[PDB]
Structure formats: structure tokens, C-alpha cells
């Protein structure tokens, strides 16, 4: 049994190895290790196919279509989708998910020297603009919330000029660095930790908020869903996911 593994390029989960390679050996990262571990645990072969548009997956109501990893699963061009793929209500409606392999939250990436100390403070001003990944799961946290403060955040993000949204974590982090403190990036704590440790001019504002999960995406009612889930839980209970997380996210 061989599974086509849809993913996207983005460190530390999945990226092109520096060559002084062929097939799966071209790639490295957290998600690469985890599929190898699961492949050995659940006994299956696999082929990594990073998606063409390099998107996570969002619904475009203007066209009634999905993109990114989620799209490849809907069209059955892939049997497994993985990265920092956050479980959302919209995504779960069109594809299935395994048990999560990582729990996380949301927080604020900022340039050092900022006076803002919380999300409430960030939304209650407009000298420092802020945004998220376009169509990403962090956008969902604000756009779907009934919480007044989150509503205000969402409406401010929509109003900012220029466009407050970015295509990925890399552009988000790059924008905070280039902006010298006039732009803050709302992102997941996992990715925030990764970048803040590798960029000394950046820091986290306030506490983590929200309860989010990364899961392996599979087609609805796939017969290898449970097999993948039991495998993830095995690695977790052994303490291997703890080690794996430290390997790629440990340390200005």
C-alpha cells in the first residue's frame, strides 16, 4: 500500500534539503519525520507531493472551490495531507482528520520595543497594524468568533491599508521585521516559537489564547484513518512526539 502525501513547503515541517536527491529523500522537517515514523508504525509506503499552489486550504465562496492540501484530498489526488494543518469546521466538513498530533494556541508576533502588551491593547489602537495568513486557520479564529474583542480585531484587520493579510508565515515574519514595529503578526504559537527563537529582534506579545490542533487530513471515511490515529497515539504515549517536537522547535 502506497499513499500520496500532499504537503506544502514551510519550515520546520517540510522543506527542500540542501544538496551538496531523489523522491522522499529530497525533503526534511517535522512532518517528514512523522510520516516516516508512521510509515514504520502503520506499515505503508508513501510519496511526498508538495501541492502546486503551496497553500494550506481554504474555501473561496466567490468560486465555490477549495485550494491547497485540502483540495488535493477532495479530488483524491492524495490520500494523506500533512503540515501545520489546523483542524477547522469548514475543513472538517469536506475532509476527515486523524486524532491531533499537536496542540497549540494563537499569539502575537511583534518587533521588540512595542508598548502593546495584550490583544485587547492591540485592537484598541491603530498606530500598529496587524494581520494573519490569508484564508488561514488563525483568520478563522477571528472571523468566526462572537467575542466582541475578536470581532473588533477582525473588523480592524479588514479595514487596514495596505492589505493586512499575508500568503504565509514567512511573509508575515518578514513583514514584522521590515516594519520596525508598525506591524504585528497574529499566528500560531508553534510557528511563533520557531521564528522568535531564530530572530532576536522579535518577541511575543501577551499570553497564548485559543485551543487549536494539528491533524493529518484524509479523505472522508477513509479506511486508513483509524490506522493512522492509533499510530499517532502510540508515538505520543511512547514520548516520541515530545522528542520530535523538541528536535525541530528547540532553541536568543
Ligand X SMILES: N[C@@H](CCC(=O)O)C(=O)O
Summarize the annotated binding site for L-glutamate as residue ranges.
84, 86, 91, 137-138, 188
Q: How far is the CB of 2 from ligand X (least distance, A)?
A: 25
Look at the alpha carbons of 132, 136, 138, 140 in this order and tell me if their dihedral is positive or negative: positive
The distance of closest approach from Cβ of residue 130 to ligand X in the complex, given in angstroms and rounded to an integer, is: 13
Cα torsion 193, 199, 200, 201 to 10°: value is -110
CA distance 139 to 133: 7
Q: Which of 56, 59, 101, 248 binds ligand X (CB under 6 A)?
A: 56
The H or E element spanning position 100 is: strand 96-111
Our finding on whether 136 is near ligand X (CB under 6 A) is yes
* Residue of closest CB approach to ligand X: 136
Q: Is 242 helix (H, G, I), strand (E, B) or coil?
A: helix
Q: Least distance in Å: CB of 186 to ligand X?
A: 7
* SS3 state of residue 1: coil
Considering CB under 6 A, how many residues would be counted as binding ligand X? 11
* Residue closer to ligand X, measured from CB, 129 or 138: 138
Report the Cα 21 to chain-centroid distance in Å.
Answer: 26
* Closest CB 25 distance from ligand X, rounded Å: 26
> Contact region for ligand X (CB under 6 A) — 1-9, 24-32, 78-86, 233-241?
78-86
Nearest residue to 204 via CA among 224, 184, 221, 220? 184
Site string for ligand X, 153-192 (x = CB under 6 A): ----------------------------------xx----
67 binding ligand X? (CB under 6 A) = no
| Nearest Cα residue to 134 out of 100, 106, 98, 171 | 171
* Span interacting with ligand X, options 14-22, 81-89, 152-160, 235-243, rule CB under 6 A: 81-89
Q: Dihedral sign, CA of 51, 157, 176, 31?
A: negative
CA 162, 164, 166, 170 dihedral sign is positive
User: CB 104 → ligand X: shortest distance, Å?
Assistant: 8
Binding site for ligand X (CB under 6 A): 56, 84-86, 132-133, 136-138, 187-188
Amino acid at each position: 500500500i502506497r499513499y500520496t502525501v500532499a504537503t506544502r513547503v514551510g519550515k520546520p515541517y517540510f522543506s527542500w534539503r540542501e544538496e551538496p536527491y531523489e523522491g522522499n529523500e529530497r525533503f526534511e522537517g517535522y512532518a517528514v519525520d512523522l510520516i516516516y515514523m508512521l510509515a514504520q508504525e502503520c506499515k505503508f509506503d508513501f510519496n511526498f507531493e508538495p501541492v502546486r499552489d503551496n497553500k494550506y486550504g481554504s474555501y473561496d465562496a466567490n468560486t465555490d472551490e477549495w485550494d491547497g492540501i485540502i483540495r488535493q484530498l477532495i479530488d483524491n489526488n492524495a490520500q494523506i495531507g500533512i503540515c501545520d494543518l489546523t483542524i477547522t469546521q469548514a475543513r472538517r466538513s469536506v475532509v476527515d482528520f486523524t486524532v491531533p498530533f499537536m496542540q497549540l494556541g494563537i499569539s502575537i508576533l511583534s518587533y521588540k520595543g512595542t508598548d502593546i502588551g495584550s490583544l485587547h491593547d492591540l485592537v484598541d489602537q491603530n498606530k500598529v497594524q496587524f494581520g494573519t495568513i490569508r484564508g488561514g486557520a488563525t483568520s478563522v479564529y477571528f472571523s468566526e468568533s462572537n467575542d466582541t474583542d475578536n470581532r473588533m480585531a477582525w473588523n480592524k484587520m479588514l479595514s487596514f491599508k495596505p492589505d493586512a493579510f499575508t500568503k504565509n508565515n514567512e511573509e508575515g515574519v518578514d513583514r514584522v521585521k521590515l516594519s520596525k514595529g508598525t506591524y504585528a503578526f497574529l499566528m500560531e504559537t508553534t510557528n511563533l516559537q520557531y521564528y522568535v527563537q531564530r530572530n532576536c529582534e522579535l518577541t511575543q506579545i501577551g499570553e497564548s489564547f485559543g485551543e487549536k490542533h494539528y491533524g493529518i487530513a484524509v479523505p472522508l471515511n477513509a479506511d486508513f484513518r483509524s490506522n493512522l490515529s492509533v499510530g499517532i497515539l502510540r508515538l505520543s504515549e511512547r514520548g516520541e512526539l515530545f522528542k520530535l517536537r523538541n528536535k525541530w522547535f528547540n532553541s536568543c
